[PDB]
Design a protein around this ligand. Sequence first.
Ligand SMILES: Cc1cc2nc3c(=O)[nH]c(=O)nc-3n(C[C@H](O)[C@H](O)[C@H](O)COP(=O)(O)OP(=O)(O)OC[C@H]3O[C@@H](n4cnc5c(N)ncnc54)[C@H](O)[C@@H]3O)c2cc1C
Length: 474
Amino acid sequence: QDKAPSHVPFLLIGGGTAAFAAARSIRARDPGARVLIVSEDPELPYMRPPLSKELWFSDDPNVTKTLRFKQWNGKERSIYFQPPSFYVSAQDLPHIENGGVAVLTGKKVVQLDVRDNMVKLNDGSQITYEKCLIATGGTPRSLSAIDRAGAEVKSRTTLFRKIGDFRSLEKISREVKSITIIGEGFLGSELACALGRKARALGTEVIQLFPEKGNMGKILPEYLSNWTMEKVRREGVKVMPNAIVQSVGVSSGKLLIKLKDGRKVETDHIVAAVGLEPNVELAKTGGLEIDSDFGGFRVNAELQARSNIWVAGDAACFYDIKLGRRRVEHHDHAVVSGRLAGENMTGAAKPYWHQSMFWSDLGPDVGYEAIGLVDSSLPTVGVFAKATAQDNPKSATEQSGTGIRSESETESRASEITIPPDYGKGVIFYLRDKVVVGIVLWNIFNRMPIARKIIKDGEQHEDLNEVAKLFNIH
Ligand SMILES: Cc1cc2nc3c(=O)[nH]c(=O)nc-3n(C[C@H](O)[C@H](O)[C@H](O)COP(=O)(O)OP(=O)(O)OC[C@H]3O[C@@H](n4cnc5c(N)ncnc54)[C@H](O)[C@@H]3O)c2cc1C
């Protein structure tokens, strides 16, 4: 029943967010389409954001089993994109009436033969295709100190990516006295807050350490990076900025992290959250171009790597309408680019002109959104205000019904943006020559279309305090 077919019209390599969106797209445009997703994981397609967020905010002990979570508004949602009975079997796929979408789980595509329109799986199965999407996502970066420390340290280090890592780390959280997160980024900070909340109830320790001066310091300016660090500290987490890891070893049963400044940190387990590299292993056999500067498969405006091979999601190095070649790690991009790839695979020939958004929540009470070029080394103007009662992720989730912020923001850009005639929220403009090239929104929701319009228009702005009024910052 899960026997690989010899041929499929639409082959999707990888079974994450972009592949699911593509399958949906293909099927909407061609209701008899036969679509095979090949997924190296055991699980059917699922979304990632809850893995560092709402799944940790449950008191139900069978969360690890069901992977149902409660949104910030109390409403239950499955991590899976659709119920498992909505897929057809791989065996049935070639000739079942009206086609369908099948998933081969626990199978990895290891070779791509582009001239022959064929892939080979790790078990030796050969599948030919008519149209192919590469949607392989990324592979977490390791830390060189872990790489050089050997197998014992490696075995006590988690690179947090999938359902399996949620399960392993949630178990570690219940069982050990101290966990250290290495990395200042959004994922590391979400995990710090999640683990920190668990630890408060157990009386245990969570450390977050990183070389930057504060959380998300590569992206946020000092004021908001510092504020974030304080929020994380308010959760009980021990945050160690300006920490440069020299080495990691085991000392009488504990991990011992040595920092350049002379500090030594003893802990039971390490989570490394220091980014990823696109999964481009198939470029070798496929002879496909990869981007040496940004990583990822190079694609054209229509997301094509070849006449009949598209790329979407984290794996794609696309041409951003404003910024040129880039890759992102955004749920929004994976949805929109996967949907577009599917449309183009069914004859749309439409260009990828979407401006991808990003969001992060540090619990129900603090959220961020970002769009465009967001880099703390650029000149910035931050405009802040006291928060109102609605300016938090929980309220945004209550109003919209969803915690997936890309859905509630919409994909749209505003049609017009006429300026109308402690701090807890604000807007940060990232600049080039008075032109806004990126925006971070701090506890401001339902305004992403305005931010997109500002950046798309690319006008010079004489007074960004006036522009901030569009974000209800006065
Ligand atoms: C824990 C976590 C939290 C996140 N939170 C947010 C958030 O709040 N907001 C946001 O904007 N973004 C968030 N992201 C980013 C977002 O989830 C990703 O951008 C999105 O998952 C990318 O989708 P994708 O389809 O490109 O890749 P993935 O969803 O990673 O799917 C790729 C799949 O392909 C499989 N695969 C790879 N190679 C092969 C092969 N050769 N054969 C078969 N299978 C293969 C992989 O195992 C994987 O299952 C988060 C990511 C993670 C990990």
